[PDB]
Design a protein around this ligand. Structure first.
Ligand SMILES: [Zn+2]
Ligand SMILES: [Zn+2]
Ligand SMILES: [Zn+2]
Ligand SMILES: [Zn+2]
Ligand SMILES: [Zn+2]
Ligand SMILES: [Zn+2]
Length: 183
């Protein structure tokens, strides 16, 4: 099972439907849910930090990003909250051409280029120390990132919206990082 923290986004339920599509169970919990409550259920293989409109209503994701033993994927706001947590810089900014520099876990079975959706207004300007950039666009330097040694992933785009090319494959890939096999 995957736990999804509700950061208020209008597409949070779409993450739960996308996971079910690829055969993965998920539960939408409040973003005030403590880590010790998520990590005590032995069937949780991973945490997703959802998108949302207000980063001030989602700062519990900070501690989760720093303390989780489980793998973490941040989407949009969740991606930003990961950057803030580890001391990276976040600043002011829909269909974007995304260039994959490191096929890493996240972009295996995805083309080197693809179109990704997000109307964000805030982006990651500098990746935290001990992170690396996996993907960028023409203008913006960080479209997706990972900690170099921890299973912590962020994507500025929403892979749970149809408008995003290969979005279910990117979610499937994070599930592979969470120890899911498929065949
Ligand atoms: Zn359901
Ligand atoms: Zn968003
Ligand atoms: Zn590049
Ligand atoms: Zn963008
Ligand atoms: Zn941007
Ligand atoms: Zn930019």
């Amino acid at each position: 099972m995957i736990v999804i923290l509700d950061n208020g986004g209008q597409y949070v339920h779409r993450i739960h439907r996308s996971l079910k599509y690829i055969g993965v169970s998920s539960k939408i919990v409040p973003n005030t849910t403590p880590l010790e409550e998520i990590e005590s259920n032995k069937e949780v293989k991973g945490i997703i930090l959802s998108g949302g409109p207000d980063i001030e209503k989602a700062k519990n994701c900070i501690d989760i990003a720093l303390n989780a033993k489980l793998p973490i994927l941040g989407i949009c706001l969740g991606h930003q909250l990961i950057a803030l947590a580890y001391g990276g810089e976040v600043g002011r900014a829909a269909l974007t051409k995304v260039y994959v520099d490191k096929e890493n876990p996240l972009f295996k079975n995805v083309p080197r280029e693809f179109n990704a959706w997000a109307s964000h207004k805030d982006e990651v300007k500098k990746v935290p120390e001990g992170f690396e950039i996996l993907a960028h666009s023409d203008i913006c330097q960080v479209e997706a990132m990972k900690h170099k040694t921890k299973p912590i992933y962020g994507v500025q785009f929403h892979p749970e919206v149809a408008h995003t090319e290969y979005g279910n494959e990117i979610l499937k890939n994070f599930c592979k990082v969470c120890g899911y096999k498929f065949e």
